[PDB]
Amino acid sequence: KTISFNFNQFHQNEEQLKLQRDARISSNSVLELTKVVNGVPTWNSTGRALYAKPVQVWDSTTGNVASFETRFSFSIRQPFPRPHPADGLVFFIAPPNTQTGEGGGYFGIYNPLSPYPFVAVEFDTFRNTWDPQIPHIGIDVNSVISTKTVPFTLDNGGIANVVIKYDASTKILHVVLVFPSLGTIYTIADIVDLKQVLPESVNVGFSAATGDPSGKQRNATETHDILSWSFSASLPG
Amino acid sequence: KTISFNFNQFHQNEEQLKLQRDARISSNSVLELTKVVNGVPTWNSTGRALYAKPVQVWDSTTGNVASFETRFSFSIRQPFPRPHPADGLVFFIAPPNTQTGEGGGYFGIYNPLSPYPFVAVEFDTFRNTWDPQIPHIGIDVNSVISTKTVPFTLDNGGIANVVIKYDASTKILHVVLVFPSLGTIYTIADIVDLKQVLPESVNVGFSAATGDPSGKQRNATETHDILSWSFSASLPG
Ligand SMILES: *[C@@H]1O[C@H](CO)[C@@H](O[C@@H]2O[C@H](CO)[C@@H](O)[C@H](O)[C@H]2NC(C)=O)[C@H](O[C@@H]2O[C@@H](C)[C@@H](O)[C@@H](O)[C@@H]2O)[C@H]1NC(C)=O
Ligand SMILES: *[C@@H]1O[C@H](CO)[C@@H](O[C@@H]2O[C@H](CO)[C@@H](O)[C@H](O)[C@H]2NC(C)=O)[C@H](O[C@@H]2O[C@@H](C)[C@@H](O)[C@@H](O)[C@@H]2O)[C@H]1NC(C)=O
Numbered sequence A, B: 001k002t003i004s005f006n007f008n009q010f011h012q013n014e015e016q017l018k019l020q021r022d023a024r025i026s027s028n029s030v031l032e033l034t035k036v037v038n039g040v041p042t043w044n045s046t047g048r049a050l051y052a053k054p055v056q057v058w059d060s061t062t063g064n065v066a067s068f069e070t071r072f073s074f075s076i077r078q079p080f081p082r083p084h085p086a087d088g089l090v091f092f093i094a095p096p097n098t099q100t101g102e103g104g105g106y107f108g109i110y111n112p113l114s115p116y117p118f119v120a121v122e123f124d125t126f127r128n129t130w131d132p133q134i135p136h137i138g139i140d141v142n143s144v145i146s147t148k149t150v151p152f153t154l155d156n157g158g159i160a161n162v163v164i165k166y167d168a169s170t171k172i173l174h175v176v177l178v179f180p181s182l183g184t185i186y187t188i189a190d191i192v193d194l195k196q197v198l199p200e201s202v203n204v205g206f207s208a209a210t211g212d213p214s215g216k217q218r219n220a221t222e223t224h225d226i227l228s229w230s231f232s233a234s235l236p237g
């Protein structure tokens, strides 16, 4: 059983996508996860976009787990450098029908008063009390406190290509981040057992957030645009 | 005990490299693993290049294993597409003082008469009886029958960027192959316990080969050039 989808661009009112909070699709085909007014990003914004249909990552009848691959391009533009850009974006896997959690350093995927499991790959731009030097790529399992982290230099306003691959036989989640204009390549990988953290069916998508009001800084913002996205999953069981 | 070297270009008579068989450094600074006469690659060629100093990947006293990262660019030019180019190149890790093995599909790293252990990342261009479709990236442990494989499409005569990273804490060996001119990214990973297969001290280097005469095809050839190479290893012990 295989499932796959591809988005060369994003059309307004895409029946295949589920938009939440501030997420919006521009007229120029970009998925803007967080609020951008008159070409300027704002703080206190959170937005998510999930693939409309649930995907089965494992089967309890056979115990088999899915292998998958996803590729996407994103762009993070940071207009106001001085204070500190925030917060970042993530590709994530969670139980179906979840609601946007806390914004800010929680990217909109963590809800303290009713936590739901999740596996996420973050592109963190703001250093929270629990983070190492930013920006960094991180593998998150149920917590925004990454199991593994790798720093990277952002191509401000530039395009970044990401490849996330999960091999069930080895339980390896490997991610590649490339900035074609800079010729830089970043890599990180960790062992993650999906069967141990997630339910059989899940939702895959993105979530991003800009500076939270509590920070008292309106400049703590940036764009979190997804330009294209393909997904392929294979469940033998 | 960290160690690292970096070759942004190769100079003839590199005191740092040990060249074996047909391996040679061209005037314009590129490391030609296999024979190329008058700008034309030939069959029946095999060559290797090893860093002259042995590196310690693990220590029996503390038991600690080294974590390392290596980056290099190569270029395979396939002048004759019709029959079938051969054979490919590999980055390998082996015991010090070994000699070039069999050519052809053995890339010059495997010796049937007296096999020595090794861990290699291959870039396979010819399909042998034990191979899946070509070209493919492959992780090889003590043999040329990859534990893990992934297909890729070669950028003929183009530049390829490679990142090989080994994390001792997880035992994950992850490799990334990027063709900047095509924008394509290929990734593969597997679990390898260096301690279980290799001695404490080893040699790191490259090996390549063109079509073996036994195939009776003079067109089974291609270049196998290395343009640059950096290596970094950190043994916490
Ligand atoms: C928030 O971003 C603004 C735009 O980048 C900052 O203002 C810019 O500050 C520059 C000097 O740091 C100055 O050359 C630019 O002209 C100015 N741009 C604009 C459109 O105002 C702003 O910096 C604060 O406000 C300015 C006016 C100065 O007083 C700075 O000393 C202030 O830090 C940023 N605000 C914060 C919280 O840093
Ligand atoms: C493939 O390359 C081999 C080089 O490693 C050639 O081996 C030959 O081995 C001889 C034994 O000591 C040596 O004198 C020769 O110099 C060398 N080849 C050359 C440059 O003449 C091999 O050559 C073939 O096999 C040898 C044994 C002779 O019969 C040659 O006349 C053959 O051409 C190369 N094979 C082919 C088919 O080109």
Ligand SMILES: *[C@@H]1O[C@H](CO)[C@@H](O[C@@H]2O[C@H](CO)[C@@H](O)[C@H](O)[C@H]2NC(C)=O)[C@H](O[C@@H]2O[C@@H](C)[C@@H](O)[C@@H](O)[C@@H]2O)[C@H]1NC(C)=O
Residues within 6 Å of the ligand: B079, B080, B081, B082, B083, B217, B219
């Ligand atoms: C070995 O590689 C050669 C270089 O591509 C092939 O020759 C080329 O074949 C083309 C059509 O096959 C032809 O248009 C080219 O003019 C020719 N180039 C040269 C310099 O020979 C060769 O192809 C075979 O052998 C040649 C001599 C011709 O008879 C072709 O018709 C044959 O297909 C390749 N040989 C093999 C083993 O395929």
Ligand SMILES: *[C@@H]1O[C@H](CO)[C@@H](O)[C@H](O[C@@H]2O[C@@H](C)[C@@H](O)[C@@H](O)[C@@H]2O)[C@H]1NC(C)=O
Residues within 6 Å of the ligand: A044, A213
């Ligand atoms: C941050 O976003 C929330 C949700 O989009 C808004 O409700 C907030 O706007 C207004 O001010 C806050 C303090 C609260 O009273 C809310 O109910 C209001 O709508 C917004 N807060 C900021 C800092 O603008």
Ligand SMILES: [Ca+2]
Residues within 6 Å of the ligand: A087, A105, A124, A125, A126, A127, A128, A131
């Ligand atoms: Ca953060």
Ligand SMILES: [Ca+2]
Residues within 6 Å of the ligand: B087, B105, B124, B125, B126, B127, B128, B131
């Ligand atoms: Ca082969």
Ligand SMILES: [Mn+2]
Residues within 6 Å of the ligand: A122, A124, A130, A131, A132, A136, A138, A144, A146
């Ligand atoms: Mn973080």
Ligand SMILES: [Mn+2]
Residues within 6 Å of the ligand: B122, B124, B131, B132, B138, B144, B146
């Ligand atoms: Mn192979």
